[PDB]
Amino acid sequence: EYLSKYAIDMTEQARQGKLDPVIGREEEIRSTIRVLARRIKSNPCLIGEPGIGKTAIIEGVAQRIIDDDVPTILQGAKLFSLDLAALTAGAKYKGDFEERFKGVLKEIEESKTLIVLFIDEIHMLMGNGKDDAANILKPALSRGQLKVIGATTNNEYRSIVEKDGAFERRFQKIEVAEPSVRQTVAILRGLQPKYEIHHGVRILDSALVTAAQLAKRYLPYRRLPDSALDLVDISCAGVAVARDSKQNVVDSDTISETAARLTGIPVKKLSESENEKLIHMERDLSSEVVGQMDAIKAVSNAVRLSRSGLANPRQPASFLFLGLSGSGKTELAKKVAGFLFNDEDMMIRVDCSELSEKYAVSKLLGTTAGYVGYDEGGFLTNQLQYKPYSVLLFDEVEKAHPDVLTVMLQMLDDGRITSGQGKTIDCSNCIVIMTSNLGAEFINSQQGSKIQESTKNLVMGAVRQHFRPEFLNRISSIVIFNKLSRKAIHKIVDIRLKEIEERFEQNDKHYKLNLTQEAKDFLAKYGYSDDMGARPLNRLIQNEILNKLALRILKNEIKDKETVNVVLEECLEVLPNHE
């Protein structure tokens, strides 16, 4: 009985129970059975992607077999899971494993009721150059009963039959696929007592639902049975630790924290501190963003939609930041990331001046099949696979070549971002920002520092001249970055010096910062041009103030309360010591 030395008697296990319940797979089972009930080519296959119930089906049919819920032909049949050592026990001496394979088929073929094999991984037999290379040992007898149910993913399947050509003329593919979200829940429910027993915890029914929905909207690279079950099992393990520490899987908190840990995506965590969350961010940003509350609100609005689920699952929120050059809109994208992730450097960004029709799409998403370089994902999906929710930033997107600009439509809506190798990324809870200086021409009208009605349409005009309407009409919001003028820049300067103090290495020296009109004007006069915007306010602060005082610090001429003043372009700040 060679079979008993290599295979697992699934029937015996089923006879003894020790199997999971099988949920919703009745039709895959019916099809499997129907093929097995055939006169000749009774060789069905369970085919799809990993983690979709392919072996569940077998436990299922094993149970149907035990209970005679099968056709006459199968009523008394038995089933064995083989593979494994059948191909490797014969580690030495030519023809040894071949003899086993044959002996097994002989054992199966003769007399002993109807025996059905289950091949878990038919691709492992493959037919490695045929010429007696394992899989090739079968075909001679595929008509001679020796019924067998196979299993393989579509990639594996396609590889086998393309290279072989006979198996696809001998076997009956049965599509096996992930369940709907509700069906997934039913599955999770069926396995619920298994996990509850092994971990000693309860699972809320709503946790099963959350895991099913979450998996569908969280893990694009894992099929629902495994994906949702892992969310359940991983969560159960976490709960078991809590149980042991001194419980159940909490739909909201166990699963959300587990998910937050596993991947991130702020939306899946959603903090309960509503009094401040999604409120305070505008104030935090206001300090960074002086005057331009309009941009803050535009962003904050999208952030608020993603939280609590108002945002559309397939529409990553996205903005186009138009405006006065030097407006500070890039830092805004980082400061938003600051709030969103408690990480200003979470983002992925692309320098769009590097883009050309000759290569840009591949620089962004990676090259395709047969071409040099497999840096799949290029600048972008290469990184999305690690941080699906990171903020995306397109520096000077206005300079991006129009073809790659068009590819970026995927970020804006119908979020099926793909990779050059024919793979799918899928973005949802991912805020995307693109930048342009087109609004500068209208902001520079100076008709109030705030861009006004009508003039903002002139901006849209400039935008239509550079961006296709196909892009523009799909942006969550197009935001215009206004003139800061003297009032904002006086505040920006006071603020920049403050914010620098807080981050100026250590608070050992401290500042007075009494700029007085002299230094406020220096920074606001020889700095903030409308076309340089705030860029020079920071540069003068660093080039003249932080630098000269730093040099005095290095000489140990400064001990306490540093001040700022000017010579009176010769002003150049030029600050005294503070020893």
Could you tell me which residues are annotated as the binding site for ATP? 48-55, 323-330
Q: Closer CB to ligand AGS, residue 215 or residue 265?
A: 215
Identity of the residue, 71 or 165, whose beta carbon is nearer to its own copies in the bound complex: 165
Q: Is 45 in the site for ligand AGS (CB under 6 A)?
A: no
Give yes or no for residue 20 binding ligand AGS (CB under 6 A).
yes
Contacts with ligand AGS in 415-454 (CB under 6 A)?
435, 437
Q: Is residue 202 a contact point for ligand AGS (CB under 6 A)?
A: no
Q: Nearer to ligand AGS by C-beta: 73 or 550?
A: 550
Of the candidate spans 16-24, 207-215, 441-449, 543-551, the one that interacts with ligand AGS by CB under 6 A turns out to be 16-24
What is the rounded CA–CA span in Å between residue 178 and residue 223?
Answer: 6
Q: Which of residues 480-509 bind ligand AGS (CB under 6 A)?
A: 481, 484, 492, 496
Residue 22 binds ligand AGS (CB under 6 A):
yes
The Cα diameter of the chain in Å comes to: 110
Residue 332 engages ligand AGS in binding (rule: CB under 6 A):
yes
- Per CB under 6 A, the list member of 44, 53, 127, 238 interacting with ligand AGS is 53
Among 70, 125, 174, 187, binds ligand AGS (CB under 6 A): 187
Selection from 533, 441, 464, 480 nearest residue 321 by Cα: 480
Nearer to its own copies, 76 or 165 (CB): 165
In the complex, minimum distance from the CB of residue 168 to its own copies, in angstroms, rounded to a whole number: 8
| 535 binding ligand AGS? (CB under 6 A) | yes
Q: How far apart are CA 509 and CA 578, in angstroms?
A: 9
Least Cβ distance, residue 249 to ligand AGS (angstroms):
16
Pick one of 28, 120, 164, 521: the residue that binds ligand AGS (CB under 6 A).
120
Q: Residue 373 Cβ, how far from its own copies at the closest point, in Å?
A: 15
Beta strand 148-153 with 172-175 is unpaired
State the number of CA atoms in the 13 A half-sphere of 97 facing the CB: 18
Coil, helix or strand for 108? Answer: helix
User: Min. distance of Cβ 397 from ligand AGS in angstroms?
Assistant: 10
3-state DSSP call for residue 560? coil
The H or E element that residue 321 is part of is: strand 318-323
| Three-class DSSP category at 432 | strand
Indicate the SS3 state at residue 217. Answer: helix
d(Cα 515, Cα 14) in Å, to the nearest integer? 84
Query: Which region, judged by CB under 6 A, interacts with ligand AGS, from 104-112, 184-192, 272-280, 551-559?
Result: 184-192
Decide if 79 contacts 61 (C-beta within 8 A): yes
Binding-site entries: 48-55, 323-330
Which of ligand AGS, its own copies, none does 119 bind, CB closer than 5 to 8 A by kind?
Answer: none
In whole angstroms, how close is the CB of 129 to its own copies at the nearest point? 12
Nearest in space to 464 (alpha carbons), one of 453, 475, 474, 472:
472
Per-residue b or e along 348-366, where b marks 16 or more CB atoms closer than 10 Å to that residue's CB:
bbbebebbeeeebbbbbbb
Cβ(249)–Cβ(236) under 8 Å? yes
Number of CB atoms found within 10 A of residue 529's CB: 12
Using rule CB under 6 A, residue 292 touches ligand AGS: yes
Residue 337 binds ligand AGS, judged by CB under 6 A: no
Tell whether residue 326 is a contact of ligand AGS (CB under 6 A).
yes
Q: Please give the residue whose beta carbon sits closest to ligand AGS in the complex.
A: 328
Q: How far is the CB of 91 from its own copies (least distance, A)?
A: 5
3-state secondary structure of 506: coil
Interface characters, 351-370, with ligand AGS (x: CB under 6 A):
--------------------
Q: Which CB atom, from 164 or from 226, has the smaller least distance to ligand AGS?
A: 226
Cα of 327 vs its chain's centroid, Å: 31
Stretch that binds ligand AGS, among 9-17, 329-337, 376-384, 441-449 (CB under 6 A): 329-337
Residue 174 phi, psi dihedral angles, 5° rounding: -120, 120
265 Rama sector, left if φ>0, alpha if ψ -120 to 50, beta otherwise:
left
46: enclosing H helix or E strand: strand 44-48
Q: Which residues bind its own copies (CB under 8 A)?
A: 1, 4-5, 85, 89, 91-92, 161-162, 165, 168, 369-370
Q: Which is nearer to ligand AGS, 60 or 420 (CB)?
A: 60
Beta bridge partners of 477: 319
Taking residue 198's Cβ as centre, other Cβ atoms within 10 Å add up to 12
38: CB partners within 8 A, 6+ apart: none
Question: What values do phi and psi take at 47, rounded to 5?
Answer: -125, 135
The whole-angstrom separation of Cα 138 and Cα 535 is 74
Q: Among residues 153 and 327, whose Cβ is nearest to its own copies?
A: 153
Closer to ligand AGS by CB, 378 or 533: give it.
Answer: 533
**Which stretches of the chain bind ligand AGS, using CB under 6 A?**
20, 22-23, 50-56, 59, 120, 187, 190-191, 225-226, 229, 288-292, 325-332, 435, 437, 481, 484, 492, 496, 533-535, 538
